[PDB]
């Protein structure tokens, strides 16, 4: 045989991220002394779009805490942010869209985005356009907050983790039909080399498990085991069920 395409993509090679036109990574600001004890006030300077990302980015200007200079941050903007707006980050900050607060200060039932799973990681959950988390409950004895995630799972995080109030901008992006092959071409031009996709039954046996035969067919079940080696693990990996889903649709992911 020969190497399968899914394994080849792990070498890097011509399948890496197209990043030349991107701005930097998008993060909250660093969890420093001012954020742990007081608050900081910044000004929104511009709202921009970057290739490959559905949400809008905001450049926010703060004063440096120790030196005489200005510091520019790049964040994922919530819906409603505008140029000239004042943004408050820290322990004592008011409940308003765009402010950044410790999770332990946000009242239950509030909608948040840009949540950090562990304190000080500068935001890792609920970042794609139109997404958000819901705050369910606090626990003061153990200092932990419960959240409902975009996928529908529940997660417990330390109450010192930060989050921005609001919803990621740019929502409703997937409801417009694409209609053309060229539109898909332009969509993936800004992301990476992964389109168009050739079906495995259309290939030859030398290069895929599904290939070959005098008809186009898989001659063996397409549900494969969790323990299969790379090159054998194609199809429906470790599926608990297959076919059309009737009635309630369960929460995906691991238990």
């Amino acid at each position: 045989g020969k190497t399968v395409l899914s394994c080849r993509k792990g070498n890097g090679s011509v399948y890496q991220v197209h990043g030349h036109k991107r701005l930097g990574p998008a993060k909250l600001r660093i969890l420093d002394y001012a954020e742990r004890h007081g608050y900081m006030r910044g000004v929104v300077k511009s709202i921009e779009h970057e290739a490959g990302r559905g949400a809008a980015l905001a450049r926010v200007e703060f004063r440096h805490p120790y030196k005489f200079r200005r510091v520019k941050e790049l964040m994922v903007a919530p819906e409603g942010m505008f140029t000239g707006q004042s943004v408050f980050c820290g322990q004592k900050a008011p409940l308003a869209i765009g402010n950044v607060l410790p999770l332990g200060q946000i009242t239950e039932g509030c909608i948040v985005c840009n949540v950090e799973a562990k304190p000080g990681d500068r935001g890792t959950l609920a970042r794609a356009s139109g997404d958000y988390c819901i705050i369910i409950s606090h626990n003061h004895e153990t200092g932990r907050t419960r959240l409902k995630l975009p996928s529908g799972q529940k997660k417990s995080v330390p109450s010192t983790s930060r989050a921005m109030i609001g919803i990621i901008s740019g929502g409703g992006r997937i409801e417009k039909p694409v209609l053309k092959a060229g539109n898909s071409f332009y969509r993936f031009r800004g992301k990476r080399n992964c389109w168009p996709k050739v079906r495995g039954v259309a290939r030859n046996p030398v290069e895929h498990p599904h290939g070959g035969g005098n008809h186009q067919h898989i001659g063996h079940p397409s549900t494969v085991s969790r323990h299969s080696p790379p090159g054998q693990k194609v199809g429906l990996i470790a599926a608990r069920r297959t076919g059309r889903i009737r009635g309630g649709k369960a929460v995906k992911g691991a238990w």
Binding site: S46, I47, A58, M81, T83, G130, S169, G170, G172, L179
Partner: protein
């Protein structure tokens, strides 16, 4: 005269891509190209540049959100909820 009976902007596609996909895309296309109301100015002046970015024609304001309309229905509910919860806090 009208120039078209119910195709509108989608007349540029001719006879391609099917009636229901065309009808579904037309609704978002019209909104994406309309002028929306700017509450800072008091006039209809917001235009979309790229997905999610809205710029006022007269005043120098840029706003984030919506991708095909200025404000999504979920965001208004979030705004009222936040305002009421803050009113309880203060």
């Amino acid at each position: 005269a009208k120039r078209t009976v119910k195709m509108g902007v989608m007349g540029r596609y001719g006879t391609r891509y099917g009636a229901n996909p065309r009808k579904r895309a037309k609704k978002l296309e019209v909104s994406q190209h309309a002028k929306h109301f700017c509450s800072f100015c008091g006039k209809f002046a917001f235009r979309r540049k790229a997905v999610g970015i809205w710029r006022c024609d007269g005043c120098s304001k840029t706003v984030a959100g919506g991708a095909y309309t200025l404000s999504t229905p979920n965001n208004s509910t979030v705004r009222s909820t936040v305002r009421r919860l803050r009113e309880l806090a203060k």
